[PDB]
Design an enzyme around this catalytic site. Structure first.
Site, PDB file in Angstrom:
ATOM      1  CG  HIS A 336      -2.195  -0.819   0.950  1.00 15.05           C
ATOM      2  ND1 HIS A 336      -2.411  -2.021   1.592  1.00 15.05           N
ATOM      3  CD2 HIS A 336      -3.265  -0.626   0.140  1.00 15.05           C
ATOM      4  CE1 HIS A 336      -3.564  -2.525   1.193  1.00 15.05           C
ATOM      5  NE2 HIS A 336      -4.102  -1.698   0.315  1.00 15.05           N
ATOM      6  N   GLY A 337       2.053   1.184   0.531  1.00 13.18           N
ATOM      7  CA  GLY A 337       2.952   2.322   0.622  1.00 13.18           C
ATOM      8  C   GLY A 337       3.804   2.230   1.862  1.00 13.18           C
TER       9      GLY A 337
END
Length: 414
Positions: A336-337
């Site tokens: 997701h990051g």
């Protein structure tokens, strides 16, 4: 070069009702085709290339080059391993290939956490496209996949409907679905399904996602920020409102993707299955973002457990699982990051799952004890179901509050 494509109109994929007029007209010949067992490969390629390009021709329309680079880059490493795995099969050559395939994605994710800007390698669909590419390196490694056309590969990889952020798919079933066109009524049944999906998508994305996301959420965040503290009653509001907005927008998107995919004659994987009525954390992950969920299940988790079995590195059957849960969900968070709150969301669902899996083992041995004791097995009615739902629903909503990074705003804007 960079100039022309910035002077070409941007179409947000499934962005408004009007999008479906264009895409509808576009796909109409393909669909009618499927009734006579015909496909129109060049026409299909043209219409796919158009809507991908239009999705990518924003004010930062440079990402078409980033996509071009990426396509070439993947062709290299997929064929690099394909040609290699014919004769020799080694552990370390596999890892290097795998790394190189995910390397453009890693750089896209690592970039804002070092400079505070986007990688020039970045284009819209990248994070979802990588799964399709890696998948093949993994499937070739195990010798379950051998022969395939560059065409077959490129079709599967840059499939238009499920491109931007759509359902993740695997090569072998996509290709087999594309190979054999479904018979007249079975195909007509899909058309029915598609309108049903589109109409429902309309309600989710254009109405409900709008009600939660842009009518109810912005004042609740303003309320909770002006209140302050580690938590408050408005922040409990943000938690529920955001969670639903996240659901309706993503599930609405997914149905559109599913519907458009249907008009192209292939039935792509499903993403949601009433995920809120889930009583269990293990059940939630069989119902939420399923294409991703199930991908990590087979290509990250199962593959980690196998290598921990291979060495028998841990003492017992329970710690090998519990480690792999925490690692699997953490990698998912990373995907997701690289922000604290994404990694937080990751380790949360890991400890969340271990707690859950532990209780299932414990509950099993309480029933085991009760059977020998002569008592009735532990109560399993509607009230017990209801309780389980209350636990997981609130666990899950809380996870989404972490995931939103509103907590970062509430705590760290100082």
């Amino acid at each position: 070069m960079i100039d022309f494509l910035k002077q070409l109109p941007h179409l947000e994929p499934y962005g408004n009702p009007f999008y479906f007029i264009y895409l509808g007209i576009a796909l109409l010949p393909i669909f009618i085709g499927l009734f006579f067992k015909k496909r129109f490969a060049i026409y299909e390629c043209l219409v796919s290339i158009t809507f991908i390009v239009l999705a990518l021709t924003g004010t930062h329309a440079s990402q078409i080059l980033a996509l071009l680079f990426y396509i070439v880059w993947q062709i290299i490493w997929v064929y690099s391993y394909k040609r290699y795995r014919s004769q020799r099969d080694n552990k370390w050559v596999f890892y290097l290939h795998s790394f190189l395939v995910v390397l453009p994605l890693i750089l896209v994710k690592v970039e804002p956490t070092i400079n505070g800007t986007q990688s020039l390698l970045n284009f819209l669909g990248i994070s979802y496209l990588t799964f399709r590419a890696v998948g093949m390196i993994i499937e070739m490694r195990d010798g379950v996949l051998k022969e395939f056309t560059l065409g077959e590969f490129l079709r599967f990889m840059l499939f238009m409907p499920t491109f931007t952020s759509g359902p993740i798919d695997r090569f072998k079933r996509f290709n087999e679905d594309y190979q054999s066109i479904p018979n007249r009524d079975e195909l007509l049944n899909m058309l029915e399904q598609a309108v049903k999906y589109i109409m429902l998508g309309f309600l989710y994305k254009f109405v409900l996602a709008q009600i939660f996301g842009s009518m109810l959420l912005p004042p609740l965040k303003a309320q909770a920020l002006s209140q302050g503290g580690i938590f408050n009653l408005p922040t409990l509001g943000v938690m529920y409102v955001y969670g639903f907005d996240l659901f309706f927008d993503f599930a609405g998107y997914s149905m559109f993707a599913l519907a458009v995919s249907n008009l192209m004659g292939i039935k792509s994987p499903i993403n949601f299955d009433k995920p809120f009525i889930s009583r269990d954390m293990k059940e939630f992950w069989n119902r939420w973002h399923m294409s991703l969920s199930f991908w990590f299940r087979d290509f990250v988790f199962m593959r980690l457990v196998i290598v921990l079995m291979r060495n028998k590195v841990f003492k017992n059957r329970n710690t090998t699982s519990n480690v792999a849960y925490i690692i699997n969900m953490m990698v998912m968070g990373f995907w997701h990051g690289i922000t604290w709150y994404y990694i937080a969301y990751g380790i949360f669902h890991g400890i969340g799952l271990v707690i859950n899996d532990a209780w299932l083992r414990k509950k099993k041995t309480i029933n085991k004890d009760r059977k020998k004791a002569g008592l009735k097995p532990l109560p399993e009615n509607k009230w017990t179901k209801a309780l389980g739902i209350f636990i997981t629903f609130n666990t899950v909503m809380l996870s989404f509050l972490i995931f939103s990074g509103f907590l970062n705003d509430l705590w760290f804007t100082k």
